Amino acid sequence: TGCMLFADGSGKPFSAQGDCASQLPPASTFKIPLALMGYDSGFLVDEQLPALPFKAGDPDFLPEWKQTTTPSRWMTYSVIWYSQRLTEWLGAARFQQYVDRFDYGNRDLSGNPGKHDGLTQAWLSSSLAISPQEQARFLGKLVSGKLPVSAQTLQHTANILRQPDIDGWQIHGKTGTGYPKLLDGSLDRDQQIGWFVGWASKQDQKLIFVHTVIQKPGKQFASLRAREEVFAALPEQLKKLV
Amino acid sequence: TGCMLFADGSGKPFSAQGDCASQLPPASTFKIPLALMGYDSGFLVDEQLPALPFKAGDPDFLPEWKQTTTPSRWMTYSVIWYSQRLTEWLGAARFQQYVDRFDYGNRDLSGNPGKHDGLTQAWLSSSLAISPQEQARFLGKLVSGKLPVSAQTLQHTANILRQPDIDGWQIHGKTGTGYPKLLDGSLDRDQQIGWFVGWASKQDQKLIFVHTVIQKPGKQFASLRAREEVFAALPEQLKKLV
């Protein structure tokens, strides 16, 4: 149920291979719509600011989460507590308004059943789910100026999301790792979902790309195998585009 | 023993307070002339490349040194093994040519006595020493286009060395932590030296700054008290400049 999708500027797919229509947890790729919310509302200033400190009681699953994070470091080490700091500040009403206006996947931010912690846990392998097709559509709106955000919100989001170049092409992307909410795809499987979503630009020309890796955990991180495979197969799509 | 120096565009000091003329180990601030050597020669490609891996046998004093380092990560966590990778690649002859043409402090790259390891250990509290005055003079040449490097070498160096802004001004800076000689042959006085060197910029207008903190070691580094003090005392100098 893995997938490699390549879409144009508008977000229209032209090459989709595998399970490109099934909805999956967005995991840390939801940091893309969050970077826009954060810059549009004013929570996030730029790439360096705000530098929020780690507090006792914040999730410390990865050692790189244990220090002061900036929006640049947030994107890099997928610091979940920095995303919760942003959402708690926005409020559940604004969060939902943004997720609705962004038309983000299933738009379900109710979270886990019972405990109504949707505000800080919706993207964390629960209520929210996006299909690789929908992700490309979303990415296509932010790259086309279709989302209700400013140029500088798009530029700050781009900067913190920037990846190594390919010739004259500017790569912007984000990795994500999540598990399907119990059985919301094809029964209990305990399979990792790797995500490598983003776009590539070279003046006028732009190209969206979405890739998923479905695997049993072991030796390689699902999302790092996704990032690798995109960088392998990208130059041909760029060449095809020119 | 400590010092707070503010210089103009050319590198000419206009305010110097404390020991601004004594030569001190440059420590990790030598990563500024190294970023220029690396970009001029072609060892360093940009801010993302090369992403060199950590190898068994490389100094692992700080945990942040233990992974794959890029030139952006090199500057931030002061990764010394990434500087040695660059110098080993340049050769001692080119290294010396650059240190001479840059007129960097005492220009002594002989290293520790007996050991012969000047190539990878010269700036690491040994042979090499620069005075806060000389540092400002050097910084003034790179900011004025006086050094024999390209515009893009200066821009890549600026990018990896960037800091949070102040009211429209662009801050570029580097922290350093070293130790002086106690006179016993080549000893270590245990008077930890903190450094915060760099420049501020708003269109035509530029301003160099050099600061040292001399203190007995503690839980945290002397250089973080230097960076803090520069950001406190900089807006007045910028206001004075306008």
Side-chain angles (χ1 to χ4, degrees):
Chain A
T1 47
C3 148
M4 215 185 300
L5 192 139
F6 298 103
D8 55 58
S10 64
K12 186 161 78 67
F14 59 86
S15 183
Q17 294 280 330
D19 207 349
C20 292
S22 291
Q23 298 204 119
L24 301 160
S28 282
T29 71
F30 185 63
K31 259 165 210 82
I32 309 166
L34 287 179
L36 294 154
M37 292 183 208
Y39 285 109
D40 190 64
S41 56
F43 183 71
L44 304 170
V45 176
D46 53 33
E47 301 78 4
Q48 312 295 77
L49 288 133
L52 307 178
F54 175 83
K55 295 175 199 164
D58 286 335
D60 46 24
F61 311 138
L62 287 168
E64 3 287 75
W65 287 4
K66 290 267 219 171
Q67 243 289 87
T68 295
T69 61
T70 71
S72 185
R73 186 173 168 92
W74 174 48
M75 289 304 203
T76 303
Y77 315 93
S78 288
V79 201
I80 71 166
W81 62 249
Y82 193 94
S83 291
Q84 310 191 315
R85 293 278 212 272
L86 159 59
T87 63
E88 278 174 38
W89 180 91
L90 267 167
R94 233 166 156 193
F95 185 36
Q96 195 71 75
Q97 282 169 239
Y98 277 111
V99 175
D100 291 9
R101 252 202 170 189
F102 285 173
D103 204 42
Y104 200 84
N106 77 348
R107 312 195 273 186
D108 204 326
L109 321 162
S110 60
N112 311 295
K115 38 205 82 69
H116 219 279
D117 66 348
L119 186 60
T120 66
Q121 235 78 238
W123 62 108
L124 274 102
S125 294
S126 66
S127 63
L128 195 61
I130 193 156
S131 107
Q133 267 160 24
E134 292 173 323
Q135 273 258 32
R137 181 64 250 187
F138 162 72
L139 261 22
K141 284 184 179 288
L142 93 85
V143 115
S144 294
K146 283 191 202 86
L147 297 180
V149 301
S150 71
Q152 60 279 11
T153 287
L154 295 175
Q155 198 73 259
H156 282 313
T157 303
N159 292 342
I160 58 169
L161 282 176
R162 190 108 151 78
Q163 295 285 324
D165 268 40
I166 295 169
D167 201 295
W169 296 82
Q170 278 192 73
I171 315 298
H172 308 262
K174 184 85 194 80
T175 58
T177 283
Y179 282 74
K181 173 66 159 276
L182 288 120
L183 45 136
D184 77 316
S186 277
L187 80 114
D188 182 45
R189 261 142 59 245
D190 181 26
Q191 293 191 299
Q192 229 186 119
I193 306 145
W195 282 102
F196 195 63
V197 303
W199 71 96
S201 54
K202 207 191 178 133
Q203 42 220 287
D204 28 36
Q205 295 220 283
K206 279 173 194 278
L207 179 122
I208 311 299
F209 59 78
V210 182
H211 183 55
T212 59
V213 170
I214 285 80
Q215 51 134 93
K216 201 277 283 169
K219 294 199 191 195
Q220 285 189 254
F221 273 119
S223 62
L224 315 189
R225 207 190 279 279
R227 185 174 114 75
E228 188 179 78
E229 280 158 45
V230 162
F231 269 104
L234 229 44
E236 61 183 274
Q237 306 300 106
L238 265 51
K239 193 255 284 81
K240 274 199 217 282
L241 205 70
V242 75
Chain B
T1 191
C3 148
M4 242 303 204
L5 192 140
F6 297 103
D8 55 57
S10 64
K12 188 166 283 305
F14 59 86
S15 181
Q17 296 277 332
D19 207 349
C20 292
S22 292
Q23 298 204 119
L24 301 161
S28 300
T29 72
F30 185 63
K31 278 183 196 62
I32 307 165
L34 287 180
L36 294 155
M37 292 183 208
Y39 285 110
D40 189 65
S41 56
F43 184 71
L44 304 170
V45 177
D46 53 33
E47 302 77 5
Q48 312 108 44
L49 288 133
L52 307 178
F54 175 83
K55 295 174 200 164
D58 286 334
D60 46 24
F61 311 138
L62 287 169
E64 296 87 283
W65 287 4
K66 290 267 220 171
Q67 244 288 87
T68 295
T69 296
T70 71
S72 184
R73 186 173 168 91
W74 174 48
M75 288 305 198
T76 44
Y77 314 93
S78 290
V79 201
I80 71 166
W81 62 250
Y82 193 94
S83 292
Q84 310 191 316
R85 292 278 212 272
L86 158 59
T87 63
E88 278 174 38
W89 180 92
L90 267 167
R94 233 166 155 191
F95 185 35
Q96 196 71 74
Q97 283 169 240
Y98 277 111
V99 175
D100 291 9
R101 252 202 172 188
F102 284 173
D103 205 42
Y104 200 83
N106 77 347
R107 313 195 273 186
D108 204 326
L109 321 161
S110 60
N112 311 295
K115 308 293 164 190
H116 224 275
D117 200 14
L119 187 59
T120 66
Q121 235 78 238
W123 61 108
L124 275 102
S125 293
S126 66
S127 63
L128 195 62
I130 193 155
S131 107
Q133 266 160 24
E134 292 173 322
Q135 274 257 32
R137 181 64 250 187
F138 161 72
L139 262 21
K141 284 184 180 288
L142 93 85
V143 116
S144 293
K146 283 191 82 92
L147 297 181
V149 301
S150 70
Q152 203 71 1
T153 287
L154 295 175
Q155 197 74 259
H156 282 313
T157 303
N159 292 341
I160 58 169
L161 278 174
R162 210 177 158 91
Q163 296 284 324
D165 290 11
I166 299 168
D167 196 83
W169 289 77
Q170 295 161 79
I171 315 301
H172 309 262
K174 184 90 203 86
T175 58
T177 285
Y179 278 92
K181 246 110 274 89
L182 185 52
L183 293 330
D184 181 278
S186 288
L187 232 275
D188 267 29
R189 191 127 49 117
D190 202 64
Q191 257 185 313
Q192 183 192 44
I193 312 149
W195 283 101
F196 195 63
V197 302
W199 70 96
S201 193
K202 220 207 193 293
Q203 49 218 287
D204 334 318
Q205 229 63 33
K206 279 171 193 278
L207 179 122
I208 311 299
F209 59 78
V210 183
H211 183 54
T212 58
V213 167
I214 283 84
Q215 60 176 52
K216 188 188 247 82
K219 298 183 176 180
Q220 300 165 329
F221 313 94
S223 45
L224 314 189
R225 207 186 244 89
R227 185 176 167 273
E228 189 177 79
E229 280 158 45
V230 162
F231 270 104
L234 262 182
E236 62 183 275
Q237 300 302 94
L238 266 51
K239 191 193 90 276
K240 274 202 218 151
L241 204 71
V242 300

